[PDB]
Nucleic acid binder design. Structure first.
Lengths: 48, 26, 117, 110, 103
RNA sequence: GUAACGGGGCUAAACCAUGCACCGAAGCUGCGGCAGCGACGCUUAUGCGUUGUUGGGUAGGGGAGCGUUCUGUAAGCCUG
RNA sequence: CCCGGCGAGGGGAGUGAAAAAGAACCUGAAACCGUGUACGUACAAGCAGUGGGAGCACGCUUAGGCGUGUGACUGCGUACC
């Protein structure tokens, strides 16, 4: 019953990915896109 | 007196050289 | 909302440069070179932590061989005799005895020679 | 007792002044003066003026008897630089540095 | 006079009134410890034993302190393969003081 | 520039057959420490025990954290 | 007040809580450049470290010995993206 004593339910506030922030994060340096090609480009992809 | 001021000039270059034959030409 | 990287960067650079003391030239003054130097030093330390044991066992064996030949028998037959007599003293202690106690080592040689023959 | 004189923003490169500086490091002042009198260098004049000023300071402010002084410390530092422009061939331009230096002399009866 | 015994998978050579460092032992800081196995005893004449464990020899000592060693650093690195990793380590130990060597 | 044993050197320190020793790796064993996944018990819920087994890693997937600047708790708390 | 070219720059004195707040003026990091002290270095071949290791100097200590700095000689070892 204090403004610094409340807390959300567990398993409800997952963090969210952050690409390209070092080796230890597991997502630096191409952030999950693999190597060169059309799909690794900025704005790249194909129609539906 | 004893106070100094100056500026700069930066027109760089204007290439167009290598008047000799090509390195491994045709 | 806007965050400045002034203090954290200095802290990290000082942390790296502190453990590069004594290195020659730019390897102890400049961050780019010092970082590589520190990484390579870590790798070398990891490898030498294993090479140390091999080196010391080699030295012990050499000293024991010298003493045994002084008493009239080679290293191989000496430790074969010690195994046949069921003695469990290891090589570090044997080398220490050989250097620091000339009579106990002679007694051990006598026992091994008796067991072997 | 320690006495100090300085010359700041002297118009000369520190590398050229350091050559004259070590000729007198550790000498008695009486022979240092005549050593500086017979060296054909521009920096010798500057160093001699600084040394004489230091001797006068030691004699007037603190105790007298310049007959027992020695040059204990002397060193040269680098001051600010002035930047200019020099034109080269084919329309290029280059940067020129005009370097200065600071001069410090310490004398001591001890 | 000195004797040889093994405690932590290793062997040691000690004498009276001497302090040794061993691997960690589950013994309180105050009381004493006993080492029944002894491989060798020497003073003028050498009571060394063919079969191990000279029959009637024990070594008396009591615990002095526990603690941890200095930190060491582990670094793993792979050239141009986007991989590295680090880790630290300290090791527990126990100090004992030799009080009596009985033949 | 020896230059077609790594060298020195070797008539056995070469080759064939038989035999017994020893050296030799981050493999295996001994001692201490950490973590993951199961099975079985206790709590009979978090958790706590008994064990068995696993822990090289790029592209990539999954799970837990540290630190920085702003808002509340803050006319609170620290500080000449 | 003193040195100096009736200079530039200093050294005293004085103001101020503070001048290492003196106008090139809050705080003043790094690269870069110097002076002083300890140790090493002029018969020795290579990513300059790492494992072993005498000698010397300083400090503590009640010997025992520790701690800090330097490091002869020796095994292994061809930067990063």
């Amino acid at each position: 019953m204090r403004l610094n004593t409340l807390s959300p339910a567990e398993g409800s506030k997952k963090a969210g990915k952050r690409l390209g922030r070092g080796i230890g994060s597991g997502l630096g340096k191409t952030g999950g896109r693999g190597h060169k090609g059309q799909k690794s480009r900025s704005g790249g992809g194909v129609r539906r | 007196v004893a106070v100094t001021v100056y500026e700069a000039w930066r027109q760089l270059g204007y290439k167009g050289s290598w008047w000799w034959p090509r390195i491994r030409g045709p | 909302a806007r965050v400045k990287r002034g203090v954290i960067a200095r802290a990290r650079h000082k942390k790296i440069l502190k453990q590069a003391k004594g290195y020659y030239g730019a390897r102890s003054r400049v961050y780019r070179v010092a970082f590589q130097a520190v990484i390579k030093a870590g790798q070398y330390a990891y490898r030498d932590r294993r090479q140390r044991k091999r080196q010391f066992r080699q030295l012990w064996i050499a000293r024991i061989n010298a003493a045994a030949r002084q008493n009239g028998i080679s290293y191989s037959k000496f430790i074969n005799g010690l195994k046949k007599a069921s003695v469990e003293i290891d090589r570090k202690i044997l080398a220490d005895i050989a250097v620091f106690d000339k009579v106990a080592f002679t007694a051990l040689v006598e026992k091994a020679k008796a067991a072997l023959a | 007792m320690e006495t100090i004189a300085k010359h700041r923003h002297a118009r000369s490169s520190a590398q050229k002044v350091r050559l004259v500086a070590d000729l007198i490091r550790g000498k008695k002042v009486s022979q240092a003066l005549d050593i500086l009198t017979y060296t054909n260098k521009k920096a010798a004049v500057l160093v001699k003026k600084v040394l004489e000023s230091a001797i006068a300071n030691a004699e007037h402010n603190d105790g007298a008897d310049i007959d027992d002084l020695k040059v204990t410390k002397i060193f040269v530092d680098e001051g600010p630089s002035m930047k200019r422009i020099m034109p080269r061939a084919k329309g290029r331009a280059d940067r020129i540095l005009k370097r200065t230096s600071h001069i410090t002399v310490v004398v001591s009866d001890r | 006079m000195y004797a040889v015994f093994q405690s932590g998978g290793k062997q040691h050579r000690v004498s009276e009134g001497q302090t040794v460092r061993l691997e960690k032992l589950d013994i309180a800081t105050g009381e004493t410890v006993e080492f029944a196995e002894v491989l060798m005893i020497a003073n003028g004449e050498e009571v060394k034993i063919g079969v191990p464990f000279v029959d009637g020899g024990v070594i008396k000592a009591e615990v002095v302190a526990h603690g941890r060693g200095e930190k060491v650093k582990i670094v793993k690195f792979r050239r141009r393969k986007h991989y590295r990793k680090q880790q630290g380590h300290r090791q527990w130990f126990t100090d004992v003081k030799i009080t009596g060597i009985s033949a």
